[PDB]
Amino acid sequence: DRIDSVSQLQNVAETTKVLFDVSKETVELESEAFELKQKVELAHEAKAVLDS
Amino acid sequence: VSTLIPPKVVSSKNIGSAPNAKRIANVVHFYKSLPQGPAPAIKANTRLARYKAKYFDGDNASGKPLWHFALGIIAFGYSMEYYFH
């Protein structure tokens, strides 16, 4: 039973490699989204003000 | 706020707690283990080893050796029974 349990560490590291990489990668790639948020807000304000 | 990393921390402690003690207890005895009756030493000769092999072995394990011992002690004691009375 211990053998069967340890059989599952055989390839966990290979997948969790890309998992841990892309986790932080995607979490920090929202910087461009944050920079786009202010531009989108400015555009929304401009459209609203000219609608006014 | 970030991703902690559990899935590769088993290095410091092997998985499980109770069977960890039994792992060292059962892994070490398999090295110096007899494959199949190695060094049986079933043959010996020291003026009494033949008697042990023939009668005092576990294959028979009968009451015949006790009866043989009784017969031998009777034979030994007959002479001094004659000597005394």
From Swiss-Prot, chain A:
The GO cellular component terms are: mitochondrial inner membrane; mitochondrion; proton-transporting ATP synthase complex
- Where does this protein chiefly localize? mitochondrion
Q: Per its record, what are the GO molecular function terms?
A: proton transmembrane transporter activity
- Keywords for this entry? CF(0), Hydrogen ion transport, Ion transport, Membrane, Mitochondrion, Mitochondrion inner membrane, Phosphoprotein, Transit peptide, Transport
Q: Which residues carry this modification: Phosphoserine?
A: 5
One GO term under biological process is:
proton motive force-driven ATP synthesis
Coiled-coil segments: none
What are the subcellular locations of this protein?
Mitochondrion; Mitochondrion inner membrane
Q: Which residues cross the membrane?
A: none
Q: Misc remark for this entry?
A: Present with 12900 molecules/cell in log phase SD medium.
Task: Give the protein family.
Answer: Belongs to the eukaryotic ATPase B chain family.
Q: What quaternary arrangement does the UniProt entry report?
A: F-type ATPases have 2 components, CF(1) - the catalytic core - and CF(0) - the membrane proton channel. In yeast, the dimeric form of ATP synthase consists of 17 polypeptides: alpha, beta, gamma, delta, epsilon, 4 (B), 5 (OSCP), 6 (A), 8, 9 (C), d, E (Tim11), f, g, h, i/j and k.
| Described function | Mitochondrial membrane ATP synthase (F(1)F(0) ATP synthase or Complex V) produces ATP from ADP in the presence of a proton gradient across the membrane which is generated by electron transport complexes of the respiratory chain. F-type ATPases consist of two structural domains, F(1) - containing the extramembraneous catalytic core, and F(0) - containing the membrane proton channel, linked together by a central stalk and a peripheral stalk. During catalysis, ATP synthesis in the catalytic domain of F(1) is coupled via a rotary mechanism of the central stalk subunits to proton translocation.
Q: What is this protein called?
A: ATP synthase subunit 4, mitochondrial
Record organism:
Saccharomyces cerevisiae (strain ATCC 204508 / S288c) (Baker's yeast)
Swiss-Prot record, chain B:
- Offer one example of a GO biological process linked to this entry: proton motive force-driven ATP synthesis
Keyword Transit peptide tagged? yes
Keyword RNA-binding listed: no
* GO CC annotation: mitochondrial inner membrane; mitochondrion; proton-transporting ATP synthase complex
Per UniProt, the keywords (alphabetical) are: ATP synthesis, CF(0), Hydrogen ion transport, Ion transport, Membrane, Mitochondrion, Mitochondrion inner membrane, Transit peptide, Transport
Localized where?
Mitochondrion; Mitochondrion inner membrane
Query: What biological function has been recorded for the protein in this entry?
Result: Mitochondrial membrane ATP synthase (F(1)F(0) ATP synthase or Complex V) produces ATP from ADP in the presence of a proton gradient across the membrane which is generated by electron transport complexes of the respiratory chain. F-type ATPases consist of two structural domains, F(1) - containing the extramembraneous catalytic core and F(0) - containing the membrane proton channel, linked together by a central stalk and a peripheral stalk. During catalysis, ATP synthesis in the catalytic domain of F(1) is coupled via a rotary mechanism of the central stalk subunits to proton translocation.
Outline the subunit composition: F-type ATPases have 2 components, CF(1) - the catalytic core - and CF(0) - the membrane proton channel. In yeast, the dimeric form of ATP synthase consists of 17 polypeptides: alpha, beta, gamma, delta, epsilon, 4 (B), 5 (OSCP), 6 (A), 8, 9 (C), d, E (Tim11), f, g, h, i/j and k.
Q: Give the family from UniProt.
A: Belongs to the ATPase F chain family.
Instruction: Give the free-text miscellaneous remark of the entry.
Output: Present with 14600 molecules/cell in log phase SD medium.
Name the UniProt record assigns to this protein: ATP synthase subunit f, mitochondrial
Q: Which gene encodes it?
A: ATP17
> What portion of the full-length protein is represented by this chain?
7 to 91 of 101
